DNA sequence: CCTTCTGGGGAATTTTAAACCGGCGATTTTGGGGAAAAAATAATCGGCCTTGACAGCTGCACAGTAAGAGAATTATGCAGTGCTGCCATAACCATGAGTGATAACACTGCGGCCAACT
């Protein structure tokens, strides 16, 4: 989710929320960061995975 | 005391009712042909009901990978030059065969001359 550019600590970044939603218990994990480079999706979804405990069977991107 | 009447039983015969089987007369059913009607299917027609769009427009940003465009560098194939050796061709003479030429008549093409119209 693009949630826009800030000024943060003056300086302009544009921030993205990552979310990752288990399909059938519905939690909700998120992190917001700077980028969406393929390192920073690889980590949001480590950090999801041990959020969660777990990883799924599958995982559902666009 | 005796005679006659009657009744029962076994055998023979007759009639009528029932059931089967066959024969005869009638209707039904199957097949084919021709006509008529119904229904099914497809196509075409009109019209009602409902809703999407028209409201400035869409180009850019990021992500990753791959392609490509331009320039520099390298590899290679062509070309150039010299020296030596071998093969091809060409030059001459003879003989045979093909075609270009020559004579004659007939038909046609081109240039010179005459006349008619504007």
Excluded at 6 to 12: F, L, N
Aim: charged share 25%.
């Amino acid at each position: 989710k693009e949630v826009g550019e800030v000024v943060i600590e003056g300086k302009k970044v544009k921030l993205s929320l990552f979310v990752a939603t288990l399909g059938y218990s519905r939690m909700k994990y998120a992190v917001f960061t700077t980028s969406q480079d393929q390192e920073h999706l690889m980590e949001c979804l480590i950090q999801s995975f041990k959020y969660f405990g777990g990883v799924p069977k599958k995982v559902l991107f666009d």
